[PDB]
């Protein structure tokens, strides 16, 4: 989101996999920040979701 | 080749700069895309100095047809890389960026390869001056009273 | 070789003699040759 | 070209400076547009030294028309890039910025390309001196007894 | 060779860059595949200046085939390393990275090796000028009255 | 031109330095305006060394008419930029400031262009020495007994 209300394009990243214990949920290229930014990070699951340590490379 | 339009060239330049691509989550606005298209047109007009500059086959869109973006540029397959690298270099200023060393080197190399063939064609030798004799070795020219080179 | 060869002439950047182009055409109305010194972006013209 | 007015030139210069563009979510200010138009007029008057400078086809506005903005610049399509790059470089100190190396180099290259054709045109040879003989090989000069070159 | 497709070239380039390989835990993303494939096509078309540049045997995909990815590149085994090292160097700025010194040196070495054989082939001596005598030592030409070389 | 007075030049110089303009929320006092006008008059008088220096057509104010500010400077259109750039450079130290590199370069370029035409006109060649014969080829001079060139 660039204004705090509306969220833009939605991209699907495999955040889990059966019987795999090292996945590295990652997105290569995020866009250029104009003024502000926020992230949604929505998940739809039937299995537990554990998430920690979100980070970016702002440069 | 997929880079078929001026919009495609601008998108390639943005992808090179890292500002916008197909994998991004935030994109630049169409007004910014139009401004970049106008900068591409200005750069090509500056290069092609009304026929005495760098010839590439670029087509300058007319204002009668409303959108300049979306018209095929008409460049050959070997000039697209140079053109969009130079475009990225030119439009990096706008976003408070600076084109990286690889981008600048590729831009220089592409411009050089763009002008190589035109330089080879233009490397012409002037004719003999108006004050050279043709020489008596040219018997055929001697028999026709062609004793001096015309010139010009 | 004698005819179709460029003669001995100086190499000039256009900015060096911009505005003094009539001093180098070959006339003898001037006691010296003037050159441009400064540029609005580079401050000073490179010396070579 | 979509750049047809002094306002378009000023907007392009401000975009390149990053002062006011869509990519930065900043709109152009009229108090910053009048100053930039005044600078553009001063720069063009300084360049075109009353006919003995860099000929560009720029159309100088008059005091009769109250708003200087809105008038076509009259520039050829191969001059706009150089002109607005130079304008951005000149008006950066107003906002106490510093035009980046890419903009400075583009302004230099564009100014040189602007003067190239006029330099080629002005590179002319003086006529023969008034004291040189015409030689005995020129049939028309021999007929008219023009033993010496006119000079001047 | 194991590297037989444009996709294999892109995977090798990304692995060398470290963006996505099994050395790390990253997997190649389709949008990172397509952009690099387009970049590779543009770079190869720039190199192969319609036959007057670097010859590699690279097969240029036509628009009729929807996926450019998956088609065989057609390069010889001795060109794959150079091609994918230079591709990694060219697509490094996409992710705002910088190719390492070893990658840059290998790219330079591979490009030189690519052009070596073509340079040897093209280093050809011009024929004899049109104004040479054939010499009286050549009895055949002397009797035939081929006293001078053809030229061109 | 929009700039038509010494105060207009001073305000342009302040705009360049970034001290005050038509959009700033703070301004400088009329005494400071008068001081800047005085510095401009001093610098113009220093340039115009009683006619033996730089000729620009500047009209010096008189004390009978009270306000020096408000008089047309009389400069041509091609001198305004140079004059106010050098004025900004000169009055920068007053406000504990320093003119930037672009302003200094433009000042140098403007002064050079200001003196270019005067230098061209002043580049004159002295007449022949009084001990130089006119030559026997100078028929009219020899007939009128002007055997030697007139001394001066």
UniProtKB/Swiss-Prot annotation, chain A:
Job description of the protein: Acts as a tail hub by assembling onto the head-to-tail adapter protein gp4, generating a channel that is sealed by the tail needle protein gp26. Together with gp4 and gp26, gp10 is required for stabilization of the condensed DNA within the capsid; perhaps by plugging the hole through which the DNA enters.
Residues spanning the membrane: none
Localization (cell): Virion
Portion of the parent chain present: 414 to 472 of 472
Assembly with partners or alone: Monomer (in solution). Hexamer; assembles as a hexamer onto the dodecamer formed by the head-to-tail adapter gp4. Interacts with the head-to-tail adapter protein gp4; each gp10 monomer contacts 2 head-to-tail adapter protein gp4. Interacts with the tail needle protein gp26. Interacts with the tail spike protein gp9; binds six tail spike trimers.
Organism domain of life: Viruses
Disulphide bridges, residue numbers: none
Name recorded for this polypeptide: Tail hub protein gp10
UniProtKB/Swiss-Prot annotation, chains B, D, E, F:
GO molecular function: hydrolase activity
Quaternary structure, from the entry: Monomer; homododecamer upon binding to the portal ring. Interacts (via C-terminus) with the portal protein; this interaction participates in the head completion. Interacts with the Tail hub protein gp10. Interacts with the tail needle protein gp26.
Protein's cellular compartments: Virion
UniProt organism field: Salmonella phage P22 (Bacteriophage P22)
GO CC aspect terms: virus tail
Keywords per UniProt: Degradation of host cell envelope components during virus entry, Degradation of host peptidoglycans during virus entry, Hydrolase, Late protein, Lyase, Viral genome ejection through host cell envelope, Viral penetration into host cytoplasm, Viral short tail ejection system, Virion, Virus entry into host cell
Gene symbol of the encoding locus: 4
Entry keyword annotation includes ATP-binding: no
UniProt KW Lyase keyword: yes
Name listed for the protein in its UniProt record: Head-to-tail adapter protein gp4
From Swiss-Prot, chain C:
Compartmental location: Virion
Family, similarity comment: Belongs to the p22likevirus portal protein family.
Role of this protein: Forms the portal vertex of the capsid. This portal plays critical roles in head assembly, genome packaging, neck/tail attachment, and genome ejection. Procapsid assembly may initiate with a nucleation complex composed of portal and scaffolding proteins. The portal protein multimerizes as a single ring-shaped homododecamer arranged around a central channel. Switches upon genome packaging from an asymmetrical conformation in the procapsid (PC-portal) to a symmetrical ring in the mature capsid (MV-portal). This change of conformation may serve as a signal for headful packaging.
Known partners and oligomeric status: Homododecamer. Interacts with the terminase large subunit; this interaction allows the packaging of viral DNA. Interacts (via C-terminus) with the head-to-tail adapter protein gp4; this interaction participates in the head completion. Interacts with the scaffolding protein; this interaction initiates procapsid assembly, thereby ensuring incorporation of only one portal ring per capsid. Interacts with the capsid protein.
Protein name per its UniProtKB record: Portal protein
